[PDB]
Scaffold this active site. Structure first.
Site, PDB file in Angstrom:
ATOM      1  N   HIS A  35       0.814  -1.216   0.000  1.00 55.21           N
ATOM      2  CA  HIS A  35       0.000   0.000   0.000  1.00 55.21           C
ATOM      3  C   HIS A  35       0.844   1.261   0.000  1.00 55.21           C
ATOM      4  O   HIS A  35       0.348   2.314  -0.391  1.00 55.21           O
ATOM      5  CB  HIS A  35      -0.975   0.040   1.171  1.00 55.21           C
ATOM      6  CG  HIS A  35      -0.348   0.361   2.498  1.00 55.21           C
ATOM      7  ND1 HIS A  35      -0.158  -0.594   3.477  1.00 55.21           N
ATOM      8  CD2 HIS A  35       0.065   1.536   3.033  1.00 55.21           C
ATOM      9  CE1 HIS A  35       0.362  -0.022   4.550  1.00 55.21           C
ATOM     10  NE2 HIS A  35       0.515   1.268   4.303  1.00 55.21           N
ATOM     11  N   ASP A  66       0.223  -7.515   1.449  1.00 61.09           N
ATOM     12  CA  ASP A  66       0.555  -6.096   1.572  1.00 61.09           C
ATOM     13  C   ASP A  66       2.067  -5.913   1.619  1.00 61.09           C
ATOM     14  O   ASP A  66       2.619  -5.305   2.539  1.00 61.09           O
ATOM     15  CB  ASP A  66      -0.102  -5.461   2.800  1.00 61.09           C
ATOM     16  CG  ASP A  66      -0.168  -3.920   2.690  1.00 61.09           C
ATOM     17  OD1 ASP A  66       0.300  -3.405   1.654  1.00 61.09           O
ATOM     18  OD2 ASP A  66      -0.663  -3.243   3.631  1.00 61.09           O
ATOM     19  N   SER A 140       5.434   3.134   8.137  1.00 59.93           N
ATOM     20  CA  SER A 140       4.869   1.982   7.446  1.00 59.93           C
ATOM     21  C   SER A 140       5.852   1.473   6.401  1.00 59.93           C
ATOM     22  O   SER A 140       6.504   2.257   5.701  1.00 59.93           O
ATOM     23  CB  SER A 140       3.541   2.347   6.773  1.00 59.93           C
ATOM     24  OG  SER A 140       2.750   1.187   6.518  1.00 59.93           O
TER      25      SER A 140
END
Length: 378
Positions: A35, A66, A140
């Site tokens: 993502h 992911d 992230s």
């Protein structure tokens, strides 16, 4: 000891700032969340210590986990090495490292709070390590490292609690992406929770993985497993917990058989099933690394103009200087037998690898110009 290099190896990814990534090869390969890079064209990498930006190329993506892999053209890269995520324990010291902009990193000291949580990722079925080190969109795709400085997860922001994708699954995806650009994984179709709430563990106690969801149209559903079944053993190996299972299934190949013991109403029960995953390739892989095979379709047979009948799988590619090549496989060969199974398809082929995993295999290989050749592998 190697905490220094882990800090050096956590890079910033941008187009505005997208997130972080981790260099996992001196070469130039970088893992991050899918993502983070999803939708970007111009992808730029900034390495700690230097202002310079590196144009990055997309090597592959794995949306289901992911994850994604990119590459820059620089060598002498610092790298983080992979720790065994199966060997981490609630309470272990960890650091979450991110590089939210191009300058300076965030390092958040914390502990592992749980081995397995799901329902929070973009994929509601994906299992994560849970920590008490908050993971924002900035860090992230950055690194979760243990006290020794090895990688036990890839931070993943949910879209004082943080989640990382366990390093053993990350390593599966990264090898697959680097070598083949694609993911090809046996799919089973189940959501899994750990018993270790210690309150159910008082309920039945031999500690495997509970199915909290059955994915429909899945080798699981048709095999008739039920929400609240307890998978306690995988092809003869006891399953400590969910992460052990997904890593067992994860290193397994599509349409391979697998036999599990399940507890239901305490009723033990048998459960053998065939994983699932345009008559298309298959590369190795996590032995025979570098071998790529595919089915001999009717059209492939006549465009190759055979005969006779030859039935087997086509060796469509052999990675140069790979264990497959060392073993003597060559592109254009046809594999017809592996011990007692007549190889007629990638399915028969994947069966044989499962039937004789870790055992010596006699490969009967037809070289169309040379004749038959025997190849013994491990």
């Amino acid at each position: 000891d190697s905490i220094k290099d882990s800090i050096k190896a956590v890079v910033n990814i941008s187009t505005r700032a997208l997130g972080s990534g981790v260099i996992i090869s001196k070469d130039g390969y970088i893992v991050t969340n899918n993502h983070v890079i999803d939708g970007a064209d111009k992808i730029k990498v900034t390495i700690p210590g230097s202002n310079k930006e590196y144009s990055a190329t997309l090597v592959g993506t794995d949306s289901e986990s992911d994850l994604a892999v990119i590459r820059i053209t620089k060598d002498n890269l610092p790298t983080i090495k992979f720790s065994d995520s199966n060997d981490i324990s609630v309470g272990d010291l960890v650091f979450a490292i991110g590089n939210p902009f191009g300058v300076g990193e965030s390092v958040t000291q914390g502990i592992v709070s749980a081995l397995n949580k799901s329902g929070i990722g973009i994929n509601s079925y994906e299992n994560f390590i849970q920590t008490d080190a908050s993971i924002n969109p900035g860090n992230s795709g950055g690194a979760l490292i243990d006290s020794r400085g090895g990688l036990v997860g890839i931070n993943t922001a949910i879209i004082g609690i943080g989640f990382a994708i366990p390093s053993n699954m990350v390593k599966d995806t990264v090898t697959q992406l680097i070598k083949t650009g694609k993911i090809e994984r046996g799919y089973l179709g189940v959501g899994l929770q750990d018993l270790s709430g210690d309150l159910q563990n008082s309920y039945d106690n031999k500690e495997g993985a509970v199915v909290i969801s059955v994915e429909k149209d899945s080798p699981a559903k048709k095999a008739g497993i039920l929400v609240w079944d307890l998978i306690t053993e995988v092809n003869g190996k006891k399953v400590k917990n969910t992460n052990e299972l997904r890593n067992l299934i994860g290193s397994m190949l599509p349409n391979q058989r697998v036999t599990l013991k399940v507890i239901r109403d305490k009723k033990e029960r048998a459960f053998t099933l065939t994983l699932a995953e345009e008559t298309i390739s298959a590369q190795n892989g996590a032995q025979l690394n570098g071998l790529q095979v595919e089915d001999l379709t009717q059209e492939t047979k006549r465009s190759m103009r055979l005969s006779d009948d030859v039935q087997g799988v086509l060796v469509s590619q052999v990675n140069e200087n790979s264990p497959a090549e060392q073993a003597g496989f060559r592109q254009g060969n046809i594999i017809t037998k592996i011990e007692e199974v007549e190889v007629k398809s990638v399915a028969d082929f994947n069966h044989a690898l499962e039937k004789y995993k870790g055992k010596p295999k006699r490969f009967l290989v037809l070289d169309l110009n040379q004749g038959y050749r025997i190849i013994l592998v491990k």
